[PDB]
Every structure is written in structure tokens, then in C-alpha cells.
Scaffold this active site. Structure first.
Site, PDB file in Angstrom:
ATOM      1  N   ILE A  10       0.675  -0.749   0.359  1.00  9.05           N
ATOM      2  CA  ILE A  10      -0.339  -0.189  -0.429  1.00  9.05           C
ATOM      3  C   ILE A  10       0.534   0.948   0.168  1.00  9.05           C
ATOM      4  O   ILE A  10       1.859   1.019   0.637  1.00  9.05           O
ATOM      5  CB  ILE A  10      -1.081  -0.679   1.082  1.00  9.05           C
ATOM      6  CG1 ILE A  10      -1.862  -1.310   1.154  1.00  9.05           C
ATOM      7  CG2 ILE A  10      -1.776   0.921   1.463  1.00  9.05           C
ATOM      8  CD1 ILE A  10      -3.267  -1.226   2.162  1.00  9.05           C
TER       9      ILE A  10
ATOM     10  N   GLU B 294      -2.621  -8.329   2.931  1.00  8.07           N
ATOM     11  CA  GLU B 294      -2.265  -9.468   4.229  1.00  8.07           C
ATOM     12  C   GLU B 294      -2.707 -10.536   4.370  1.00  8.07           C
ATOM     13  O   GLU B 294      -2.905 -11.427   3.937  1.00  8.07           O
ATOM     14  CB  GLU B 294      -1.622  -9.136   5.675  1.00  8.07           C
ATOM     15  CG  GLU B 294      -1.281  -8.001   6.566  1.00  8.07           C
ATOM     16  CD  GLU B 294       0.476  -9.000   5.683  1.00  8.07           C
ATOM     17  OE1 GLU B 294       0.856  -9.164   5.042  1.00  8.07           O
ATOM     18  OE2 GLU B 294       1.339  -7.505   5.646  1.00  8.07           O
TER      19      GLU B 294
ATOM     20  N   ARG C 277      -2.659 -12.175   1.047  1.00 10.36           N
ATOM     21  CA  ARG C 277      -1.217 -12.894   0.878  1.00 10.36           C
ATOM     22  C   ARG C 277      -1.872 -13.907   1.607  1.00 10.36           C
ATOM     23  O   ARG C 277      -1.000 -15.537   0.781  1.00 10.36           O
ATOM     24  CB  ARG C 277      -0.068 -12.454   1.514  1.00 10.36           C
ATOM     25  CG  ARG C 277      -0.011 -11.165   0.726  1.00 10.36           C
ATOM     26  CD  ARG C 277       0.971 -10.295   1.823  1.00 10.36           C
ATOM     27  NE  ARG C 277       2.429  -9.013   1.231  1.00 10.36           N
ATOM     28  CZ  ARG C 277       2.292  -8.179   1.782  1.00 10.36           C
ATOM     29  NH1 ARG C 277       1.099  -7.996   3.100  1.00 10.36           N
ATOM     30  NH2 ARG C 277       2.773  -6.657   0.558  1.00 10.36           N
TER      31      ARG C 277
HETATM   32  N1  LIG Z   1       2.603  -0.357   3.286  1.00 10.67           N
HETATM   33  C1  LIG Z   1       2.287  -1.956   3.831  1.00 10.67           C
HETATM   34  N2  LIG Z   1       1.144  -2.537   2.876  1.00 10.67           N
HETATM   35  C2  LIG Z   1       1.587  -4.020   2.862  1.00 10.67           C
HETATM   36  N3  LIG Z   1       2.290  -4.522   2.975  1.00 10.67           N
HETATM   37  C3  LIG Z   1       3.221  -3.964   4.030  1.00 10.67           C
HETATM   38  C4  LIG Z   1       4.252  -4.553   4.725  1.00 10.67           C
HETATM   39  C5  LIG Z   1       4.616  -5.829   4.838  1.00 10.67           C
HETATM   40  O1  LIG Z   1       4.829  -5.524   6.340  1.00 10.67           O
HETATM   41  C6  LIG Z   1       5.739  -7.451   6.217  1.00 10.67           C
HETATM   42  C7  LIG Z   1       6.800  -7.329   6.829  1.00 10.67           C
HETATM   43  O2  LIG Z   1       7.846  -6.305   6.606  1.00 10.67           O
HETATM   44  P1  LIG Z   1       9.523  -5.693   7.557  1.00 10.67           P
HETATM   45  O3  LIG Z   1      10.244  -7.111   7.184  1.00 10.67           O
HETATM   46  O4  LIG Z   1      10.009  -5.327   6.618  1.00 10.67           O
HETATM   47  O5  LIG Z   1       9.053  -6.335   8.671  1.00 10.67           O
HETATM   48  C8  LIG Z   1       6.416  -7.194   4.576  1.00 10.67           C
HETATM   49  O6  LIG Z   1       5.588  -8.382   4.103  1.00 10.67           O
HETATM   50  C9  LIG Z   1       5.992  -6.384   3.614  1.00 10.67           C
HETATM   51  O7  LIG Z   1       5.203  -6.645   2.938  1.00 10.67           O
HETATM   52  N4  LIG Z   1       4.650  -3.890   5.251  1.00 10.67           N
HETATM   53  N5  LIG Z   1       3.855  -1.960   5.153  1.00 10.67           N
HETATM   54  C10 LIG Z   1       3.353  -2.586   3.943  1.00 10.67           C
END
Ligand SMILES: Nc1ncnc2c([C@@H]3O[C@H](COP(=O)(O)O)[C@@H](O)[C@H]3O)n[nH]c12
Length: 246
Positions: A71, A160, A163
């Protein structure tokens, strides 16, 4: 564009929205029958627009990068709001050209930064479909502390859930009552990259992972995923992040 309306939403229209969100993301191959997301798409084609409507019918349009379900920003009325990070700026060149003003939110869109800005870790924010309605209402009126908390609900109930079939199910149980995410939901969220990488590297290694992924489960703690016959692989993960993006 995919769309979801919270008025009259129940567990199955929600499953129907998450199904359409998954089906709107392009892929070329399936690795072990899971859609492998593309390395890059270029142009405005890289962005999916989701139109979300709350109980009362007000809407926000959210922009999602189709290569990783990330996002990037949203449009609320005539103002676009984008995360403070490079990919979101690139994205501001292709989406919401029509906005009267563009505000950059004072944080990037990753979980650490959003939790810090919100004042609560994910484990303390109730998610569900009432919380999503609330989140849409909060995003309609700029406040960056309250927008961080609403964006944490918004990422987990859309991106999420797309996924992982387990998180989608968690949100369908929370359709009329919110509840904080299970540790299993937090574990899974954090493991998408790792799990995507090992399922990909498991081809040409007989379905065996080069290095095991450790998750905490739906009873308590510590679980190691070593190969593709795990139920996490056969039943749960629904989209794989391409290794070129890891
Ligand atoms: N703005 C966003 N929109 C969708 N997914 C995420 C994520 C998801 O956070 C999950 C964990 O992130 P880190 O591995 O950086 O902690 C990753 O799978 C990432 O795709 N963070 N922010 C997001």
C-alpha cells in the site's frame, strides 16, 4: 479496480473481495501452484486501485503496487496522501493526478515506523471488519497519529489477507466484532518474504527449503517449516514475492 462496501458486508462478500484482489495481481508462473508475482511492471500498470466504502458509504481509493501488494498511498476526497518513501513518490507520478493537493505522511509505510507513530504495536490493535470501517472514516480526515493506527488496520485486512488464507479467515471470524491478531497472524505477516524466497529456492531442491522458516503457531510458539508439503505452503500462502524483489 477492485471494490468493497462495508454496508451489508458479511464473511462471504469479504472472501469475495479478497478473491478479486488476489485475482487482480498479474503473474506469469505459479511456483508449486501459488502465483508468483512479477519482478517489475512499469508505468501506471504497476498500481492497483481498491475502492473501499464505509458503512455510511464514504470512500477512499487506495493504491497498491501489484509486484508486492504494498500500500503506497490513498485519495480521500481531493487530497492524496502518500507514505514518505521513494516508491511512494514514484507512485505519486502515476496515480491520483487529479488531487487538489498531495500530502506526504511523516513516516514510511513499514510496520516498525507505523507502530512507533501510532503508539501501539500491532498486537494491541483490534482488527476486523468494524475496525476497517473505522479506519476508512479516520483516513477521510487528516490526522497523522490516528492515520498510522488506521493504516495498520487497513494493511492487514486487505494486503495481508490477500497473501495468506489464514489471515483472511481471521478477518471473516472478526466480521461483527474486532479482536487483536493472534501471534500466528503477526508471525505470518513478518515471514512473507522469507517463505516466498524458500518456496522459490525449493524448486530444483526437491521441494526442500535451503534454510527453514520458523513461525509460531495457532496453539502457542516455535514451528519450523522445512519443505513445500507443509500446510503453510499447500493451504495458506496465496501469493509469492518474486526473488528479484527480495
Ligand atoms: N504498506 C504496506 N502495505 C503492504 N504490506 C506492507 C508491509 C509488509 O510488512 C511485512 C513485514 O515487513 P518487514 O519485513 O519490513 O518487517 C512485509 O511482508 C511487507 O510486505 N509493510 N508495510 C506494508
Amino acid at each position: 479496480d477492485v471494490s468493497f462496501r462495508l454496508s451489508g458486508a458479511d464473511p462471504r462478500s469479504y472472501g469475495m473481495f479478497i478473491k478479486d484482489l488476489r485475482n487482480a495481481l498479474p503473474f506469469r508462473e505459479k511456483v508449486y501452484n501459488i502465483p508468483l508475482l512479477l519482478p517489475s511492471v512499469s508505468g501506471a500498470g504497476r498500481y492497483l486501485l481498491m475502492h473501499l466504502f464505509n458503512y455510511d458509504g464514504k470512500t477512499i481509493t487506495v493504491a497498491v503496487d501489484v509486484t508486492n501488494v504494498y500500500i503506497m498511498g490513498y485519495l480521500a476526497d481531493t487530497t492524496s496522501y502518500f507514505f514518505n518513501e521513494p516508491a511512494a513518490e514514484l507512485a505519486s507520478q502515476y496515480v491520483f493526478r487529479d488531487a487538489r493537493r498531495k500530502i506526504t505522511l511523516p513516516y514510511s509505510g513499514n510496520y516498525e515506523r507505523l507502530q512507533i507513530a501510532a503508539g501501539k504495536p500491532r498486537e494491541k490493535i483490534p482488527i476486523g471488519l468494524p475496525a476497517l470501517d473505522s479506519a476508512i472514516s479516520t483516513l477521510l480526515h487528516y490526522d497523522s497519529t490516528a492515520a498510522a493506527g488506521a493504516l495498520l488496520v487497513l494493511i492487514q485486512t486487505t494486503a495481508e489477507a490477500a497473501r495468506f488464507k489464514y489471515i483472511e479467515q481471521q478477518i471473516q471470524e472478526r466480521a461483527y466484532r474486532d479482536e487483536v491478531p493472534s501471534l500466528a497472524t503477526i508471525s505470518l505477516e513478518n515471514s512473507w518474504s522469507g517463505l516466498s524466497k524458500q518456496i522459490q529456492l525449493a524448486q530444483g531442491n526437491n521441494g526442500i527449503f535451503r534454510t527453514p522458516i520458523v513461525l509460531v503457531d495457532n496453539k502457542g510458539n516455535r514451528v519450523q517449516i522445512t519443505n513445500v508439503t507443509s500446510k503453510v505452503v499447500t493451504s495458506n500462502i496465496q501469493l509469492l514475492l518474486n526473488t528479484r524483489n527480495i
